[PDB]
Amino acid sequence: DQLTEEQIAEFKEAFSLFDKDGDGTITTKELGTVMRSLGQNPTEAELQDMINEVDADGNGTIDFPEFLTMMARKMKDTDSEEEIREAFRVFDKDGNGYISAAELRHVMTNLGEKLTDEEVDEMIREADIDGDGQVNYEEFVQMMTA
Amino acid sequence: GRKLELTKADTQLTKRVKNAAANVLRETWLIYKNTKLVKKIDHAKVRKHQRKFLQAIHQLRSVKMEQRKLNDQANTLVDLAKTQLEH
Ligand SMILES: Nc1nc2ccc(OC(F)(F)F)cc2s1
Ligand SMILES: [Ca+2]
Ligand SMILES: [Ca+2]
């Protein structure tokens, strides 16, 4: 419900991440492109619902003041520790709270966007606190989110 | 900065809610009446109202899941906009 001067300028830059063809408005078509660029697949009705929840004048598009207004309502952030721990748990084959340094390389060099073997070495150096070649991922996530 | 933190968590959907919620009230009443306020339980009647009851309850669950989906799509866009606060 309250925004600073610095935040208004930064949210102007954010508006450009959404206004793809640069005409000062966000359409359902532009919103669909941005959402798909984030690996999401909103339906036509979901895109129209997102436009309609923030479009006050009912012209079917989002302008900068409507965009800024909705940002004010959701400024509150929360820690992501539990969610990140749940992403590590996907790779905990035996559900014992550990992922070996070998399994971490196997996952990080083959799945998603990937890390190089050298980047994996830097991550394991930090993650493997005990130097036992095993990562207690609850502890590692707690360290990163501290 | 924000580091690893993220944003803290329509006439058509409203219409779906009101009709389904009225149907939950209708069917809860009719199952109650046909199981507790009758001298002889008619099982064909109970089966019919149980089918209408489950369909209304599951319609309300479907709307609630759709509202949670819409809310996370909105949180995704707010999270993307908040990346520009990193300066
Ligand atoms: N209830 C809602 N809050 C928001 C906040 C931001 C938003 O992104 C957009 F880019 F459309 F502005 C959509 C919505 S729908
Ligand atoms: Ca535009
Ligand atoms: Ca508008």
Side-chain angles (χ1 to χ4, degrees), chain A residues 43-69:
Chain A
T43 64
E44 182 54 27
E46 290 164 353
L47 291 170
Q48 293 173 339
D49 288 348
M50 277 190 280
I51 300 276
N52 297 358
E53 247 277 277
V54 327
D55 177 40
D57 43 42
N59 57 9
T61 59
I62 307 162
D63 60 14
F64 187 63
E66 288 158 343
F67 176 85
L68 251 190
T69 294

Side-chain angles (χ1 to χ4, degrees), chain A residues 2 8-9 17 22 26 28 30 36 39 46 49 54 64 66 74 76 84 86 91 99 111 124 136:
Chain A
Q2 205 164 339
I8 293 155
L17 299 176
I26 304 160
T28 55
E30 294 171 296
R36 284 189 303 278
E46 290 164 353
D49 288 348
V54 327
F64 187 63
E66 288 158 343
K74 297 192 168 181
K76 189 77 192 176
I84 295 164
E86 288 184 337
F91 305 108
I99 299 155
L111 296 68
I124 299 166
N136 181 312

Side-chain angles (χ1 to χ4, degrees), chain B:
Chain B
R2 283 172 72 253
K3 290 168 262 185
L4 300 164
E5 303 211 348
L6 299 166
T7 301
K8 192 177 166 75
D10 186 22
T11 54
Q12 210 113 87
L13 290 189
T14 300
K15 174 87 173 179
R16 284 188 182 185
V17 170
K18 294 251 178 188
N19 286 297
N23 282 339
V24 169
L25 273 54
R26 184 190 195 266
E27 299 316 320
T28 300
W29 164 250
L30 293 167
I31 287 165
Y32 179 72
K33 181 186 166 183
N34 283 288
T35 60
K36 313 219 202 159
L37 300 168
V38 295
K39 196 198 174 291
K40 68 287 111 193
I41 298 171
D42 182 329
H43 293 95
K45 279 187 173 188
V46 181
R47 289 188 267 103
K48 181 182 186 187
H49 297 302
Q50 283 185 333
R51 173 178 48 79
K52 297 183 176 181
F53 173 69
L54 72 90
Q55 78 182 5
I57 287 290
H58 286 285
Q59 282 158 10
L60 285 178
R61 292 184 182 172
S62 285
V63 171
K64 184 181 177 178
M65 285 187 283
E66 188 58 22
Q67 196 52 60
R68 286 230 311 115
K69 183 180 185 199
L70 285 167
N71 289 352
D72 199 58
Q73 284 171 344
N75 291 346
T76 302
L77 300 168
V78 172
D79 284 330
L80 179 64
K82 289 175 173 169
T83 66
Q84 293 308 130
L85 300 169
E86 181 62 31
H87 279 290

